[PDB]
Ligand binder design. Structure first.
Ligand code: SF4
Ligand code: SF4
Ligand code: SF4
Ligand code: SF4
Ligand code: SF4
Ligand code: SF4
Ligand SMILES: [Zn+2]
Lengths: 65, 78, 190, 79
């Protein structure tokens, strides 16, 4: 079902702030990289076919089914 | 219907230190901050006596880092 | 030393972590040092890829490192390096089910070269503890047989490993291991 | 140029205030050492501060954070 495109994701919380399934962990910010980088974790136990977060993402980084 | 943008976000202008972590990392390039000072700072790494991360601890804009040690089979003599 | 980080030098060419020197370079440097000082005994050498099938090729690769030296000393010795327990280095094949003996090739090379002297590591087919100064072989053996394992890393110098092992008669692997040393000794012209 | 005070009564000689001071670590652990003077040295089992005239300390707190049983008080005010 769910699939993110880490190629086009900026790790903006506006995708994990909506659903209770999407929890976005920003691993600690270090000037090493100087960038934001984390992971998007989706759990089945909370989803729906709502698909709101597909278009809530600023980018098109989320396709769900 | 188009766009959502619920709410409003600002920057407490008497607290920003012009580090630019938020402008460099903003997704939509919507933040305009300009550094108050200009110049250059250099670090002679070969003169740090190791376990003294006081500079790292006190940097306000967390510009400083301890460069992460590479794993084995990746050090490549450096 | 790569074991001190948890890796192993599986061939003669791969570099050491952070040192970018290779087994070949270090063996050659120690041979030059030894024959220059004229020490009594030569560079006694263990080798690489110990205890795995197909490592007779690597054994020949490491034995070809002496082709350009001559034993100079006031003592009588014709070796320049001494390759030890060679029945351990003379395996052949891919795994333990397609595993046979490369003693013929090893002793052909030794019967050719007169600056290489050897010894056999004949297995006596009983219960024993195996102690070699290299870690990776002992760790690999422990992961094979699930028995005790002791590791003693030294500071800036070596490693260690102690692992019991059963060379019992009821295994094809142990039988072939027994046969290999006899083939080595009985193929010796000198 | 601050002032450090070591409570000799509960100092155990652990030597983790000597090893951890970044001014002590200048001599042996720097490329082309600049200054080779040392704040602490454990003489007779307790840490003695050779920096009598308070010229080399930098208020880092690596030594206060290092001592296992807090015994080093760092003074941030002029002596
Ligand atoms: S899915 Fe969209 S909103 Fe969520 S982290 Fe990725 S880019 Fe940001
Ligand atoms: S599809 Fe709907 S329910 Fe599922 S994660 Fe996205 S917003 Fe949440
Ligand atoms: S990240 Fe830096 S520049 Fe941006 S608001 Fe915060 S202090 Fe100011
Ligand atoms: S604070 Fe940083 S730069 Fe200063 S001595 Fe310690 S490690 Fe070196
Ligand atoms: S505060 Fe820092 S510089 Fe001063 S004595 Fe302690 S460790 Fe040394
Ligand atoms: S670290 Fe503390 S206990 Fe140890 S020598 Fe220094 S002052 Fe004494
Ligand atoms: Zn050996």
């Amino acid at each position: 079902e769910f699939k993110v495109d880490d190629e086009k994701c900026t790790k903006c919380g506006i995708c994990g702030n909506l659903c209770e399934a999407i929890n976005v962990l920003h691993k600690p910010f270090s000037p090493e990289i100087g960038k934001v980088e984390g992971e998007v974790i989706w759990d089945e136990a909370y989803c729906d076919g709502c698909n709101v977060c597909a278009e809530a993402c600023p980018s098109e980084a989320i396709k769900v089914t | 219907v188009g766009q959502k943008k619920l709410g409003n976000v600002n920057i407490i202008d008497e607290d920003c230190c012009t580090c630019r972590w938020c402008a460099i990392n903003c997704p939509t390039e919507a933040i305009t901050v300009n550094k108050i000072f200009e110049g250059e700072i250099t670090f002679h790494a070969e003169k740090c006596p190791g376990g003294c991360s006081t500079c790292v601890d006190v940097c306000p804009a967390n510009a400083i880092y301890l460069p992460t040690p590479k794993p084995a089979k990746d050090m490549k003599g450096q | 030393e790569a074991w001190a980080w948890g890796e192993n030098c599986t061939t003669i060419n791969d570099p050491v972590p952070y040192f970018d020197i290779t087994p070949a370079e270090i063996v050659k440097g120690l041979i030059e040092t030894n024959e220059y000082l004229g020490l009594p005994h030569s560079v006694h050498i263990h080798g690489n890829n110990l205890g795995n099938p197909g490592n007779y090729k690597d054994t020949l690769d490491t034995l070809r490192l002496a082709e350009s030296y001559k034993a100079k000393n006031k003592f009588g010795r014709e070796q320049v390096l001494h390759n030890t327990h060679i029945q351990f280095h003379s395996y052949k094949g891919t795994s333990w089910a397609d595993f046979e003996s490369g003693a013929k090739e090893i002793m052909d090379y030794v019967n050719a070269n007169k600056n290489i002297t050897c010894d056999i590591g004949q297995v006596t087919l009983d219960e024993t503890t195996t102690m070699t100064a290299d870690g990776p072989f002992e760790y690999h053996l422990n992961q094979l047989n699930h028995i005790k394992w002791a590791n003693v890393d030294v500071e800036l110098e070596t490693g260690s490993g102690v692992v019991p092992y059963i060379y019992d008669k009821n295994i094809k692997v142990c039988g072939i291991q027994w046969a290999i040393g006899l083939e080595l000794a009985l193929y010796a012209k000198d | 140029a601050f002032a450090v005070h070591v409570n000799m009564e509960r100092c155990t000689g652990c030597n983790n205030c000597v090893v951890a001071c970044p001014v002590n670590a200048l001599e042996l652990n720097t490329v082309n050492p600049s200054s080779t003077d040392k704040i602490y040295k454990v003489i007779n089992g307790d840490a003695v501060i050779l920096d009598v005239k308070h010229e080399l300390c930098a208020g880092c707190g690596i030594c206060v954070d290092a001592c296992p049983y807090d015994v080093i008080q760092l003074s941030g005010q002029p002596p």
